[PDB]
DNA sequence: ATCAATATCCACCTGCAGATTCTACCAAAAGTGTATTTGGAAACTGCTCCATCAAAAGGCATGTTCAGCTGAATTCAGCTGAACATGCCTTTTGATGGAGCAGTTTCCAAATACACTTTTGGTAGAATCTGCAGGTGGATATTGAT
DNA sequence: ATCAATATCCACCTGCAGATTCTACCAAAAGTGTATTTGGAAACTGCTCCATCAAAAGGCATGTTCAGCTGAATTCAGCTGAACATGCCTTTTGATGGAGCAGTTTCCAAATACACTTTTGGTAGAATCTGCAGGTGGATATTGAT
């Protein structure tokens, strides 16, 4: 019989197989990893990647450019209440969200 | 005239200028040299991948900029506009970097 | 090679101002520049000391960007975009 | 020779999917890779612990599901759970 | 009759309460609140007595710590009264916001 | 129910925290903060309960939830 | 003849090794001496806290160490305070009032 | 039934302070303490081996993990205790 | 500050009960001894990639001046938040009996790890493609003097 | 007001640094088939959890009175921003040598995996005993006031 990738079998773009392997080389000791744990896991990584790329891409549109740069990722992430909370990492290249307090503004 | 911008006008231009850009703000060579002085005083005869020195500058600037925002909130709260070392110590204490 | 000293002053008054500009700071008292340099050295030390501990444990002589990335994660200052 | 695995292929695929016109610079792709590995670790981290607290040698889709409820906030969690349940059921059916 | 100047009994309470270690929220009102809150996530739940006790401990720790930071923001503004704008600032530098 | 967390009690807490004079608006403010705190901790605890198919939130479920919010607590099983 | 006794420690080297196996990873192998080293360290740190805590109970004139003492030992030591940002339940806080609040 | 470090904590108490006893609430804190540090060390040591593509957690990982976790004087003395316990164990 | 009178606090003893410590045996693990198994040491070696050097040019750091406006005093009164002695309702606490339900079991299917033998999907450089960095120039603000 | 004087735009423009696509073995994902657990699934069994009751004793809520704090206003010394002149030292373009990382092997020391034999650590009663929380009475600290 002919090979069908587990990714395909799951309707996913992310690599179920490679993720299953990465999961085995983690935990615990006599740690078993279920068949579907890899599939469920690929689905969320893929979903989250989609959610971030969607927002970054809109950013680069508002800026009249074709290519997503780290700035764009930073705007997308800081802009979204959900993602800003999930991702309190530091985006290299990011910059900050332009913002100035009122009491500094010229009276 | 000769033309002078009033105090605080060029400051606001620079805030906008720099919040818009994303390039590193500290000069590359002096910083690398500082990273070497510090590692030197920890373990002699050490080398650095170029991107290792870069990772450090990214993180430090990220750090200092983030700190100045907190420092700046302490300043406004004290009903000022000028940041002082007194503010930095308050920001840093509350973050529990010195407690 | 050549003795390295006083490199903390390599972080000029002008560079610190730019950083405070991105921080959205409008007026800066004169005592900040020396306060800042001191905060930065405490930060840089802690991170470099950890990176080097990862370097020595791997019996390498070269601090890798991976070492710095792990060192930063230890301290909860995760960096994206150097992880290779 | 010697080769590092990446996620760039799959990030690039998902990208075409959402914004078929848009491209991603190299540095930006590098961040997305850090982003994926990061999350993957948090999930596996949490799922590992969950299994430990319940005397369970194995990690199942049910762990991964709880791991995701604990890590993702609000609306992100709800959509992620659907997407993963969906993929899991469609995987067992197929 | 005998009156104490404002701030005097206040300082005795600080000294008194920084000395003891009991919980300072009443036990039953607290438990009632915990259950009411938990009812919105799962229904008909039982709690171990020690779990209610962990919450109240984690919780009073938390609030006390935060009052310290709030007080520091207040002193920084040359006041002595804490106001909610001090709690806000404190919670913000902490990244809880 | 949140109002059952009384003004005097909140005054006691502040006192331990080193507070000498308290504004009248702090009381309402604190309740809201304390409610966000318990909401976040319980939600995690109950998530750990359900996964265990239990109906009883244990002290370990709470310790675990707390450890996740980076508010580690010693004295209840870890 | 027990490993703890062999290694010179009160702490249980054997139970620690079995704890380390069920950690990491899927091909996890655990060295003989890692169990000992780990055990040596938990015992050292335990000795260090209990030392200071005992001091805090003698200076308060009591025989039994309570959580209050553990809190005072820990917060009063720069290094232990740095390493333990947990919450000691029933620990209280270090008494301390800011100057500007003291009544002149 | 639950393993505890209660026994071994009490033993250590009598060595440093044979006069003092320990209440149960406080004994529960020492438990939390030992578990926490154990988890922190163990976690760091695996990560270490993982970064360096290894499978076995040797005392070399535990020692480095300690350098990384403990603040300084605490790290010296703990390393001392460590290398002390490990040599004496391999002599006998 | 002494001269008052409240009221707080601090030491020194005091007596039981609620916890602590000390005592009594049954298993789940810790300690052996044997037989593989395996990983990560040691040893060459190919070859990125890091330290160093040179050199020229211009982007920036530095130092001075000069004065605008900010922070830090100081004074004021309105009014908020402390103290308090009053009044009662809701928390505490302590058995009590009933029961939900965590936590042990003792099984068999479902699910999972192995262990081989094809069979692709990905990766590392090649080969092509092109967004956009960084340069210009006048609309269009934005500021600040009069 | 309304002009200067500069700063900020926003567009159009082009070759190249940096993407997107083009090929070529290799590790690894996928197909089997067989060996082994797992974590479920009923069935109970104690054990803590909720729900009563039913009081006294706090501890909270309430209304007064006013001290004293915060905030508003006013003033001014001088700190810090802006601009300008000056010229250093960072940046950027190459090359070179060689340190040292990383890819291969070959393989003893060290680790696992049994399979038993002993030992300890966890329970659950037994046996003290620490200190809680309660007296007295003796200075202390606080606040009114010659």
Numbering used by the authors:
A (entry chain C): 14 to 120
B (entry chain E): 37 to 135
C (entry chain F): 19 to 102
D (entry chain D): 31 to 124
E (entry chain A): 38 to 134
F (entry chain B): 25 to 102
G (entry chain G): 17 to 120
H (entry chain H): 33 to 124
The authors write:
Histone H2A.Z, one of the most widely distributed histone variants among eukaryotes, is reportedly involved in many biological processes, such as transcriptional regulation, genome stability, chromosome segregation, cellular proliferation, heterochromatin organization and epigenetic memory regulation, probably by modification of the chromatin structure. Two non-allelic isoforms, H2A.Z.1 and H2A.Z.2, exist in vertebrates, and a splicing variant, H2A.Z.2.2, is also expressed from the H2A.Z.2 gene as a minor or tissue-specific transcript. In the nucleosome, two of each of the histones H2A, H2B, H3 and H4 form the histone octamer and about 145–147 base pairs of DNA are wrapped around it. In the present study, we determined the crystal structures of human nucleosomes containing H2A.Z.1 and H2A.Z.2, and discovered a structural polymorphism in the L1 loop regions.
However, the structural basis of the differences between the nucleosomes containing H2A.Z.1 and H2A.Z.2 has not been elucidated owing to a lack of structural information for H2A.Z.2. Human H2A.Z.1 and H2A.Z.2 differ by only three amino acids. The structural polymorphism and distinct dynamics of H2A.Z.1 and H2A.Z.2 may be caused by the amino-acid difference at position 38, which is serine in H2A.Z.1 and threonine in H2A.Z.2. The H2A.Z.1 Ser38 and H2A.Z.2 Thr38 residues sit at the C-­terminal edge of the α1 helix, which is located just before the L1 loop. Therefore, this amino-acid difference may directly affect the neighbouring L1 loop structure. The structures of the L1 loop regions were found to clearly differ between H2A.Z.1 and H2A.Z.2, although their amino-acid sequences in this region are identical. Our FRAP analysis revealed that H2A.Z.1 exchanged more rapidly than H2A.Z.2 in living cells. However, in vitro there is no obvious difference in the stabilities of the reconstituted H2A.Z.1 and H2A.Z.2 nucleosomes, as revealed by a salt-resistance assay.
